[PDB]
Amino acid sequence: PNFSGNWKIIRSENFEELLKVLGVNVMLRKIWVAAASKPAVEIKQEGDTFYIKVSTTVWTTEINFKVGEEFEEQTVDGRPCKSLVKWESENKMVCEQKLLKGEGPKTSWTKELTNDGELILTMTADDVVCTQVFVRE
Numbered sequence: 001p002n003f004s005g006n007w008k009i010i011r012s013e014n015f016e017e018l019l020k021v022l023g024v025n026v027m028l029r030k031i032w033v034a035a036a037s038k039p040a041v042e043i044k045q046e047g048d049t050f051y052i053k054v055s056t057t058v059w060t061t062e063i064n065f066k067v068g069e070e071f072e073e074q075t076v077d078g079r080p081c082k083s084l085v086k087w088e089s090e091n092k093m094v095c096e097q098k099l100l101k102g103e104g105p106k107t108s109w110t111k112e113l114t115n116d117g118e119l120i121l122t123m124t125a126d127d128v129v130c131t132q133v134f135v136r137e
């Protein structure tokens with residue numbers, strides 16, 4: 001299908017509980033939530049190759065990967081990891097992450113397209129699941 005587009009967020013669930021699990025402490029969480037949980041996402045897709053830009057007001061992250069091809073990126077909390085993306089359906093990809101150094105919670109994210117226009121992100125830390133919902137620009 002086509003994940004390609006400029007996405008803006010309409011819903012966000014359990015983002016604070018995600019950071020709590022990740023170890024961010026209370027004060028930092030509250031701010032992070034309030035300032036930096038209206039992010040912009042841009043995706044350009046060339047088949048099974050992905051460019052992904054996620055940006056706050058003063059921060060940007062650029063992710064590049066081919067599906068099935070192991071790459072390096074960051075956990076939600078800024079820690080470096082090895083990632084691998086696989087398909088689970090036509091409109092849904094899944095990514096597992098292994099830390100580069102450290103022990104830490106088990107992290108992953110998924111990404112799905114509805115047919116009703118929605119782009120759905122999940123990020124997972126152990127048994128907590130943050131769900132963010134986007135529609136197009």
Ligand SMILES: *C/C=C(C)/C=C/C=C(C)/C=C/C1=C(C)CCCC1(C)C
Pocket residue numbers: 036037039052054056063075076077078109110111121
């Ligand atoms: C396919 C979609 C992907 C890979 C989206 C990833 C989104 C993130 C890794 C979001 C990360 C965030 C931070 C690292 C801090 C600011 C808050 C978020 C949720 C925008």
